[PDB]
């Protein structure tokens, strides 16, 4: 037994290098061990299991090995339970030990996935861990157990997680739990649907006590010392290092913790006020824009009304970020944050208004509607001078003219126009330019002449949905191209483009170009160009089915009439897609269709475009 | 501090009195290290006191009795809140209520301590508040400073139903319930039950009479 155990452990530890994985040796060893594992103790089996497993070795012999040892461990544990109520079953009580259960959880948790046998086995060891929980004294082992369960994608019973949290509470005195393991446990418990708020309260307390202890330690060091008695990039790095030293966590994860606490309804006084001065303020400059947005939404949900935090953030955004660099979403979130009447008025509201004007005038629907609502909320306050609202009046007139343009294009929904008109009516706005009156007259003509039905029949629903999805992908919070667009969003956009014909997509792209100039991202333009090229190439399109299998769908026969193809040529001329405009395949297909239909001017244009391309 | 939302002013004052009464004993401080820790705890205490004065300002906004503001200022000075702006608001509020107040209801010891707590410059700016505090401390109530926080809450604000009932109070409530269940026509049983109630009226809650009289109405 000992010789075979040593040999198999030596081979398993030698299999760390992929060059040392051999088929002959594994074929010699694994079945011989397979037939004799009924003579092996649970400790020996776990020692064999714990050694490193090669991927090929795991797929060829590892999975069945683990399943059989799991079955044997379940059998010996059942025998031990019956006793409490190859001679190994006779001594099953001693073999099944709490340390054995803990190491089994740690090892098989990170090695198993979403399987039925794994689920049953894990439920068995969870019941046995409930039986032997009280013996463990290091909460880090429980944290590792929770992480293993999270990897396994299996949710134990709620009472089990409550017991684990109570054990965390009990064991924390003897051995304090670190802030990073506390964060990991918090994420795991939130992901596995643990509703009980007490564990979240305890974990937040465990994080905050460590943070304030470190802050007090540095302050007492400074006080004892005094009793005895690119530069921007460098400052950002130093601030990040200080924050990581104090909180033992990256700023993004701290901000997402704060956002989670805000979502769960925790008070702002006990979780933002203590950390505002030492943590948030000095590290604010080095935050990534995603962390900026998360923190802004955290303050919004927390209903924070402390100018001590509000004013420096506005000062940083106005003087250290610049209007061109700050995403308008964060600016809108800040304006909503200062909107509520209970929020005291900061002394630098004019800076925020000027930044809003600069950002929303340099760039060039529902967004304008919400902007108008929050401007109304700001104007409701009596501490706002009229002259400071004078630029906001011009902003609202700009929005009115933009709606004047959108109503002519039959793109904007009339409900948003009604909401905007109601806003201007309840604001008693001084419509000096009169564009609001012209908008109301055009809305009256819409309601009287054609109606909403004819207005919505002016265009195609497919084009509208393609435009909406294109705008959503383009307006996704990439935070100034800081983060690449998600692969899941890429797949969703590709699926949306696949189900829609090329002509509708081109019409949507032309409408987007007309409405917004130079507002299309390079990635979305490349995606649209690839979709159109694949559609018109004749080689088919790659579609990801419900089984996640790539299938070559043949291109749909676009039955284009003479007028329809002339419109297609016009859209090709007016599209912002340079690749599509210069694509020889599209022009060749248009030439073929023109030859089949028999028009001469389109043929001449296609010939000239092909000559220029070649 | 965590579970403090929509705090009645009386309950906040009672909690402040409890915090004051549980203050640590003062000993000679080692000037090297542990006095630094003393200041380190003092700043946290001051932050908690700032959280408290937030609700104090809220209570000023909605409206509070003079007894509540006097007790809150007493406790805040005893713990230590040297802002000199909140005290200006306190003096302003007392000046607002100076005419519509009675010196025969407030506490003399509280008046002396709050007059000491409020700076002489603040009283110089507000003379009517100074006269009112002088009148209260010269003529008022004595003995309300040594009362336990629960006794202070009960005497100051009845109908709180926070502390558990004693045996005599529970017996009185049982008598009230049995009177309620009894029919109106049966005058003898009601007379007997009322006579039983008034035999222990001294040891029962004063506010509970509002229920007792109600039976006579129903």
């Amino acid at each position: 037994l000992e010789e075979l155990v040593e040999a198999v452990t030596l081979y398993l530890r030698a299999t760390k290098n992929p060059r040392l994985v051999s088929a002959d040796e594994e074929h010699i060893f694994f079945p011989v061990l397979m037939e004799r594992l009924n003579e092996f103790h649970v400790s020996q089996l776990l020692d064999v299991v714990e050694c490193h497993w090669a991927r090929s070795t795991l797929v060829r012999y590892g999975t069945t090995f683990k399943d059989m040892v799991r079955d044997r461990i379940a059998l010996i544990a059942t025998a031990a339970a019956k006793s409490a109520s190859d001679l190994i079953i006779l001594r099953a009580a001693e073999e099944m030990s709490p340390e054995t259960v803990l190491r089994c959880i740690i090892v098989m948790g990170m090695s198993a996935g979403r399987r039925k046998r794994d689920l049953q086995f894990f439920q068995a060891m969870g019941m046995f861990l409930v039986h032997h929980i009280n013996h463990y004294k290091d909460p880090h082992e429980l944290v590792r157990v929770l992480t293993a369960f999270a990897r396994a994608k299996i949710v134990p019973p709620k009472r089990f997680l409550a017991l684990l949290g109570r054990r965390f509470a009990v064991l924390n005195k003897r051995k304090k739990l670190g802030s990073l393991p506390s964060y990991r446990a918090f994420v795991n418990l939130y992901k596995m649907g643990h509703d009980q708020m007490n564990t979240f309260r305890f974990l937040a307390d465990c994080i905050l006590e460590t943070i304030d202890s470190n802050i007090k330690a540095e302050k007492k060091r400074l006080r004892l010392a005094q009793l005895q008695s690119d530069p921007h990039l460098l400052q950002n790095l130093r601030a990040r290092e200080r924050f990581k030293r104090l909180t033992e966590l990256k700023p993004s994860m701290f901000t997402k913790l704060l956002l989670v606490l805000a979502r769960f309804g925790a008070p702002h006084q006990q979780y933002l006020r203590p950390t505002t001065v030492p943590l948030i303020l000095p590290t604010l400059r080095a935050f990534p824009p995603p962390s900026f947005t998360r923190l802004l939404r955290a303050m919004s949900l927390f209903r924070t009304t402390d100018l001590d935090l509000i004013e420096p953030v506005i000062d940083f955004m106005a003087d250290s970020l610049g209007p061109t660099n700050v995403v308008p979403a964060d600016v809108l979130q800040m304006v909503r944050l200062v909107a509520p009447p209970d929020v005291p008025v900061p002394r630098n509201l004019v800076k925020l208004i000027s930044l809003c004007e600069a950002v929303y005038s340099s760039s060039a629907p529902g967004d304008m509607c919400a902007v108008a609502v929050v401007l109304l909320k700001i104007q409701m306050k009596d501490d706002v001078p009229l002259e400071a609202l004078d630029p906001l009046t011009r902003l609202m007139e700009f929005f009115a003219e933009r709606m004047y343009l959108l109503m002519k294009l039959h793109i904007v929904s009339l409900t948003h126009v009604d909401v905007f008109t109601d806003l201007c009516r309840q604001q008693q706005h001084p419509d000096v330019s009169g564009h609001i009156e012209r908008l109301c007259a055009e809305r009256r003509r819409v309601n009287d002449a054609e109606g909403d039905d004819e207005y919505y029949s002016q265009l195609d629903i497919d084009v509208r949905e393609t435009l909406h999805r294109i705008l959503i992908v383009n307006d996704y919070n990439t935070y100034g191209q800081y983060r690449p667009t998600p692969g899941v969003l890429q797949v969703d956009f590709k699926q949306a483009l696949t189900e829609v014909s090329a002509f509708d997509v081109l019409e949507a792209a032309d409408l987007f170009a007309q409405a917004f100039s130079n507002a299309l991202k390079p990635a979305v333009e490349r995606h649209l160009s690839r979709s159109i090229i694949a559609k018109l190439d004749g080689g088919g399109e790659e579609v990801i089915t419900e089984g996640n299998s790539i299938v070559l769908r043949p291109p749909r026969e676009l039955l284009l009439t003479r007028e329809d193809l002339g419109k297609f040529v016009c859209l090709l001329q007016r599209t912002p897609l340079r690749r599509v405009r210069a694509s020889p395949v599209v022009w060749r297909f248009v030439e073929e269709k023109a030859k089949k239909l028999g028009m001469d001017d389109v043929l001449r244009v296609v010939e000239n475009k092909l000559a220029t391309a070649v | 501090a965590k579970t403090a939302s929509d705090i009645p002013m009386i309950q906040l004052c009672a909690a402040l009195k409890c915090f004051v009464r549980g203050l640590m004993q003062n000993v000679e401080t080692q000037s090297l290290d542990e006095q630094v820790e003393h200041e380190l705890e003092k700043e946290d205490m001051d932050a908690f006191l700032r959280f408290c004065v937030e609700n104090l300002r809220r209570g000023f906004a909605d409206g509070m009795e003079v007894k509540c503001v006097m007790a809150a200022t007493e406790s805040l000075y005893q713990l230590g809140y040297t802002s000199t702006e909140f005290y200006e608001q306190v003096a302003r509020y007392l000046g607002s209520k100076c005419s519509s107040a009675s010196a025969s209801v407030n506490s003399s010891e509280t008046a002396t301590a709050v007059c000491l707590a409020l700076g002489e410059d603040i009283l110089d700016r507000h003379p009517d508040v100074h006269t009112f505090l002088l009148e209260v401390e010269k003529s008022g109530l004595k003995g309300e400073a040594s009362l336990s926080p629960t006794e202070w809450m009960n005497k100051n604000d009845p109908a709180n139903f926070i502390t558990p009932l004693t045996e005599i109070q529970q017996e009185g409530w049982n008598i009230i319930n049995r009177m309620v269940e009894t029919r109106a026509a049966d005058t003898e049983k009601l007379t007997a039950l009322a006579n039983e109630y008034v035999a222990i009226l001294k040891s029962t809650r004063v506010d509970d009479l509002k229920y007792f009289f109600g039976v006579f109405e129903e």
Binding site: D195, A266 | S5, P8, I10, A159, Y211, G214, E217
Partner: peptide
């Protein structure tokens, strides 16, 4: 709000402030 966890607290407590905002006459009696 999940953080409340089925605890009305001071808004649903027995304090005199909450007991002084109703006009029933206290006739039937609790």
């Amino acid at each position: 709000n999940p953080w409340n966890d089925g605890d009305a607290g001071w808004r649903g407590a027995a304090t005199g402030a909450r007991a002084n905002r109703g006009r029933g006459g206290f006739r039937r009696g609790r």
